[PDB]
Amino acid sequence: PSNKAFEKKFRFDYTNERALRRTLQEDLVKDVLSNAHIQNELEREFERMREDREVLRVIFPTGDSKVVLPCNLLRMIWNAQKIFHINPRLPSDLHPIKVVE
Amino acid sequence: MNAPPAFESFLLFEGEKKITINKDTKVPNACLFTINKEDHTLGNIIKSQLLKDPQVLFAGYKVPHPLEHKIIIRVQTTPDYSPQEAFTNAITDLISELSLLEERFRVAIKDKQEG
Amino acid sequence: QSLETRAEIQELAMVPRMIVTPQSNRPVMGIVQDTLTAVRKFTKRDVFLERGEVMNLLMFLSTWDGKVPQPAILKPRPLWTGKQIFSLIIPGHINCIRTHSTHPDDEDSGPYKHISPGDTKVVVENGELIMGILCKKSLGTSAGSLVHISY
Amino acid sequence: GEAFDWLLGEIESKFNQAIAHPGEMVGALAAQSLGEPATQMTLN
Amino acid sequence: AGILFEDIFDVKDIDPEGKKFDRVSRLHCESESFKMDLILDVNIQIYPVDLGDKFRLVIASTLYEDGTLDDGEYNPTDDRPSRADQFEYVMYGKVYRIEGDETSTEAATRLSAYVSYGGLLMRLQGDANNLHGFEVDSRVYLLMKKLA
Amino acid sequence: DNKKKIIITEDGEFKALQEWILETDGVSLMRVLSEKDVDPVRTTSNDIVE
Amino acid sequence: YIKRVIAHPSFHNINFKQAEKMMETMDQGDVIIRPSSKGENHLTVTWKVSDGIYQHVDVREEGKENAFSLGATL
Amino acid sequence: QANQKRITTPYMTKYERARVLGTRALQIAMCAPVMVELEGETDPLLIAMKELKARKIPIIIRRYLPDGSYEDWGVDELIISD
Amino acid sequence: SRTPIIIIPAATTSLITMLNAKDLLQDLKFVPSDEKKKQGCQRENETLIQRRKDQMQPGGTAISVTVPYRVVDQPLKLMPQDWDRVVAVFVQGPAWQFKGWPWLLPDGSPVDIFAKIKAFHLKYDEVRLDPNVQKWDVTVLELSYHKRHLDRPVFLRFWETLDRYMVKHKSHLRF
Known part of the structure; x- marks a missing residue:
């Protein structure tokens, strides 16, 4: 992806409260909006991803994203969605700081 | 060199039982009937007759291996009924139909021969 | 000739352990010949089975739990589809997306992306064949096939 | 949260399952893995 | 009741892209009371349908008017009163996808089930309020009846 | 694209540029690498002893 | 007495005197199951009625494939 | 190579599983005392598999390092996956 | 009262025991009874389970209701109304545990009890499943010995299965 698309898709946005309300439950939304330690953690997450992206650009100087790796993460996420009856159309109770840690 | 004798497909071996009954424990009111030295002839007619019974929920048969001479019939009935009862009643119905068919064929042959 | 060599063969080299090869991280065995041609026909959208035919096929399903599923069509006549029976065959609750060989190239970008006119998109979800015609791409030896995901 | 925790456990389990086993005769395996496709190909 | 949706549809096109299967045809229908859009595969060998036909369509989560739920197993010897008695063509299925026009900030106004x-x-596609009973992975019954 | 020149635009995207490349019949890798206007980073040989 | 194969916490392949010796330091109501001298189809169940008092109950074995095995029905 | 810090994998390898099962089965076949309840079991390999699942095989795996040292792992100290 | 009742096998060899049962069902996580013995927990004759379930309500509103559940290690000491209130019992294998209960067939087969109430069986995946359990009609829950992240799905499965059946059968009781 391009720089703009990369930032759009991968950088957590803790300013837009309407979108946050769409995605997260209310208590998590308040914590994300108010807490500053959490926001710094999310920014560090994105900076780590940006450095990773530069490294990948070096490893695969062509644009070939297809790689051979052990754990099929997308299939595992789909399995988790089915096992736990995840309704995508509702805000979730997963704190974004819990993902980072 | 390894050919089985032809009679092996219809003659019971010493000690072999014609029919064995077991319970199917996955679901209630289900039995497996194993029949030795029979093939699609009996299995198919019995299954079709069982499917005519409104108190039979499942009826099917299979030959596990064409080089062996066994058929398995699986029957499930409603709880107010028994797979043993359904099997017995299916055989009785088939015998009745065959007897009627034999009588009527005799009558038709006689008519055709007279004129 | 000994319990130790028997145990070696049992634990290292039995056919089922060999289903995926490290040469190319994909299955070495797939569905071939009659079974493949027939399963392609079986999973077409307009394959309907009566009560008796269904019971016979279930007779041949070694892992069947003994419950006849609700037919996809209840009236005017109870009819099961090939996809329902095949769903009974699929193990666990695996999830897999594939495309049939005759899948048109522009379908995925038009409307009907998720409701295929030709039934050319294979979707197994929660162990159930929701849509699509099975073929070599879904049951063969290629990486990411249904048999690979089952393994 | 529950699904995420299950996911973390599943990733760890599968990753550990993917690790090479000491005793693996990887030289013979590599020789077979290159020779068999060679039998599949032509001289010209 | 257990009824998720109900309306009367007019068949506007059949197999617009040509016939893909011998015994199944794809109907394109529009409803009038709620302006819903419908695409539906039908076994036309057993239930023939012609252009311009009208039918009453019901999507229900259960066949029992008392609202009781089902195990999802064939129960042919059950004789409780059933909604299926009022209808000609009945199918049993599963919701596999719900799409909408929602944005990152706004709820959907149009849903597709x-x-x-x-x-x-x-x-089934239309205004989101008509389609609020539909949940992914839920089983539904489709009830159809031609009306003259 | 396996021989095209792949760049990263200032917007941050991979872009394949068509450019002229030369294939020879023999090999003198050291001399060809030192020729002016020849790319000394990518110019290569299929002869591994060289 | 004949040795047996029973992976039970309270089973000991000991004679009656040996069981009593170990049972003297145990608590009231404890049980020790040991091979029965009556034969290969019997088991002796020893439990401490009270300090210094012990009751032995003979249990017959029916439906065993080997003498050392435990009877199907006791 | 003090077993204080054993640096080899905490998982039993497939080769270790195969050979442990075989060796224990041969021992059972030669009237070695069994470690689990045999209830209705007679094949030595099946008994050995039961013992392995119960973590009762009385065998120690001695893993040699390339350097020459070794590490001793009780069959019950290793994680059995398959 | 209206709080359902769960019956756990009395033998200590089962993978579920009174203290372990509270933890398993309350927290939906596995803990071998041996670890709890190391912890020196105190076994109680009666135990309580506080499960938080979201309530299906119109309009999408969810209220995290904490319905208590009652666990009895010894089921003999229950009054007939309490016996009626019972809805689930785990079977550890042998049938001698069940003998002494109401609704038991004269032969001794507990199939009548299992038809009336839901019975599960809990054991490790590797262990061969008790043939006596297989003949009866009891659901089976498989727990991995080493992987500890496979317990939340299976215990969710147990709760969901018990619910579905119970709401269908007995609605007066506070499921």
Whole structure:
């Protein structure tokens, strides 16, 4: 992806409260909006991803994203969605700081 | 060199039982009937007759291996009924139909021969 | 000739352990010949089975739990589809997306992306064949096939 | 949260399952893995 | 009751892209009371349908008027009163997808519910309020009746 | 694209540029690498002893 | 007495005197199951009625494939 | 190579599983005392598999390092996956 | 009262025991009874389970209701109304545990009890499943010995299965 698309898709946005309300439950939304330690953690997450992206650009100087790796993460996420009856159309109770840690 | 004798497909071996009954424990009111030295002839007619019974929920048969001479019939009935009862009643119905068919064929042959 | 060599063969080299090869991280065995041609026909959208035919096929399903599923069509006549029976065959609750060989190239970008006119998109979800015609791409030896995901 | 925790456990389990086993005769395996496709190909 | 949706549809096109299967045809229908859009695969060998036909369509989560739920197993010897008695063509299926026009900030105004009836596919599309009973992975019954 | 020149635009995207490349019949890798206007980073040989 | 194969916490392949010796330091109501001298189809169940008092109950074995095995029905 | 810090994998390898099962089965076949309840079991390999699942095989795996040292692992100290 | 009742096998060899049962069902996580013995927990004759379930309500509103559940290690000491209130019992294998209960067939087969109430069986995946359990009609829950992240799905499965059946059968009781 391009720089703009990369930032759009991968950088957590803790300013837009309407979108946050769409995605997260209310208590998590308040914590994300108010807490500053959490926001710094999310920014560090994105900076780590940006450095990773530069490294990948070096490893695969062509644009070939297809790689051979052990754990099929997308299939595992789909399995988790089915096992736990995840309704995508509702805000979730997963704190974004819990993902980072 | 390894050919089985032809009679092996219809003659019971010493000690072999014609029919064995077991319970199917996955679901209630289900039995497996194993029949030795029979093939699609009996299995198919019995299954079709069982499917005519409104108190039979499942009826099917299979030959596990064409080089062996066994058929398995699986029957499930409603709880107010028994797979043993359904099997017995299916055989009785088939015998009745065959007897009627034999009588009527005799009558038709006689008519055709007279004129 | 000994319990130790028997145990070696049992634990290292039995056919089922060999289903995926490290040469190319994909299955070495797939569905071939009659079974493949027939399963392609079986999973077409307009394959309907009566009560008796269904019971016979279930007779041949070694892992069947003994419950006849609700037919996809209840009236005017109870009819099961090939996809329902095949769903009974699929193990666990695996999830897999594939495309049939005759899948048109522009379908995925038009409307009907998720409701295929030709039934050319294979979707197994929660162990159930929701849509699509099975073929070599879904049951063969290629990486990411249904048999690979089952393994 | 529950699904995420299950996911973390599943990733760890599968990753550990993917690790090479000491005793693996990887030289013979590599020789077979290159020779068999060679039998599949032509001289010209 | 257990009824998720109900309306009267007019068949506006059949197999617009040409016939893909011998015994199944794809109907394109529009409803009038709620302006819903419908795509529906139908076994036309047993239930023939012609252009311009009208039918009453009901999507229900249960066949029992007392609202009781089902195990999802064939129960042919059950004789409780059933909604199916009022209808000609009945299918059993599963919701496999719900799409909408929602944005990152706004709820959806139009929803599309996709259902698979053992591989015969249905897409019901319209205003989100009509489609609020539909949940992915839920089983539904489709009830159809031609009316003259 | 396996021989095209792949760049990263200032917007941050991979872009394939068509450019002229030369294939020879023999090999003198050291001399060809030192020729002016020849790319000394990518110019290569299929002869591994060289 | 004949040795047996029973992976039970309270089973000991000991004679009656040996069981009593170990049972003297145990608590009231404890049980020790040991091979029965009556034969290969019997088991002796020893439990401490009270300090210094012990009751032995003979249990017959029916439906065993080997003498050392435990009877199917006791 | 003090077993204080054993640096080899905490998982039993497939080769270790195969050979442990075989060796224990041969021992059972030669009237070695069994470690689990045999209830209705007679094949030595099946008994050995039961013992392995119960973590009762009385065998120690001695893993040699390339350097020459070794590490001793009780069959019950290793994680059995398959 | 209206709080359902769960019956656990009395033998200590089962993978579920009174203290372990509270933890398993309350927290939906596995803990071998041996670890709890190391912890020196105190076994109680009666135990309580506080499960938080979201309530299906119109309009999408969810209220995290904490319905208590009652666990009895010894089921003999229950009054007939309490016996009626019972809805689930785990079977550890042998049938001698069940003998002494109401609704038991004269032969001794507990199939009548299992038809009336839901019975599960809990054991490790590797262990061969008790043939006596297989003949009866009891659901089976498989727990991995080493992987500890496979317990939340299976215990969710147990709760969901018990619910579905119970709401269908007995609605007066506070499921």
